[PDB]
Design a protein around this ligand. Structure first.
Ligand SMILES: CCCC[Si](CCCC)(c1ccc(OC[C@@H](O)CCC(=O)O)c(C)c1)c1ccc(OCC(O)(CC)CC)c(C)c1
Lengths: 11, 238
């Protein structure tokens, strides 16, 4: 599954 | 014995923690207000969601964390977030009344606040015992931030791909913590201190499993999932 909010905070 | 590469690591982690932990707790006013069944779930959901953001900011500054793939970075933060929150919450925990005091009385939390979010004693009592035992360790801030970083970079987290690279990063932080205790923590506090800290990491896995069980049960109700945040649903699950 994709984690776009986690990925964005990981910049 | 404490190499300058190791002193450098400790200083980065100290700076990272100070950049990601606000002891004024000013951002708490932007949460949904504390309401005293499940009356504290909206406020506690915002609190965890906010804390997840801080754990990510800290984790990004761990030496070597960025050398992992984005996938490995995600599985480590997904698995460790609630444990790091448990660890970093200990700084506001007070043993005079076994509560988390974040300034004002509205933001002073006890066990009844946890139960007023859907959680039972199966988690609450081991959690208070953990907070007390961690406080009794009287960790240096250097040891506190090292323990949070070691927690995050654990190669046995589920879904980890490059376990040996995760293990190498953790080993550098582990040897830094072991060497720091021997050279900078005076007796009698240093006695078996590394062993006691690794035990807390084991307790955190147990606390993680119990929180996941209760979270999965609570979030199974759409009425409860509605009061959560998008970040919490992404990290902790649907
Ligand atoms: C009443 C609060 C009880 C203590 Si909490 C101990 C953690 C135990 C998991 C806690 C967490 C963070 C925190 O903030 C300090 C820094 O992070 C922020 C400073 C900064 O970064 O600036 C403090 C002070 C306490 C807690 C929080 C939410 C909980 O419910 C979560 C959920 O499952 C409900 C279904 C899903 C939402 C539960 C069960 C416990």
């Amino acid at each position: 599954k994709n984690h776009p909010m986690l990925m964005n905070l990981l910049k | 014995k404490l190499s300058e590469e190791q002193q450098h690591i400790i200083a980065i982690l100290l700076d990272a923690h100070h950049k990601t932990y606000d002891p004024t707790y000013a951002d708490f006013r932007d949460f949904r207000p504390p309401v005293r069944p499940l009356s504290m779930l909206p406020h506690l959901a915002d609190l965890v969601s906010y804390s997840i953001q801080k754990v990510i900011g800290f984790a990004k500054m761990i030496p070597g964390f960025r050398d992992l793939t984005s996938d490995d970075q995600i599985v480590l933060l997904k698995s460790s977030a609630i444990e790091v929150i448990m660890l970093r919450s200990n700084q506001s925990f007070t043993m005079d009344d076994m509560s988390w005091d974040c300034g004002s009385q509205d933001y002073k939390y006890d066990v009844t606040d946890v139960s007023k979010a859907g959680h039972t004693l199966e988690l609450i009592e081991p959690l208070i015992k953990f907070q007390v035992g961690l406080k009794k360790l009287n960790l240096h801030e250097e040891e506190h931030v090292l323990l949070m970083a070691i927690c995050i970079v654990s190669p046995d987290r589920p879904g980890v791909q490059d376990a040996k690279l995760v293990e190498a990063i953790q080993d550098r932080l582990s040897n830094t913590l072991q060497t720091y205790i021997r050279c900078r923590h005076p007796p009698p506090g240093s006695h078996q201190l590394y062993a006691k800290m690794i035990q807390k990491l084991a307790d955190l896995r147990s606390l993680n499993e119990e929180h996941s069980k209760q979270y999965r049960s609570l979030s199974f109700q759409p009425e409860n999932s509605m009061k959560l945040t998008p970040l919490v649903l992404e990290v902790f699950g649907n």
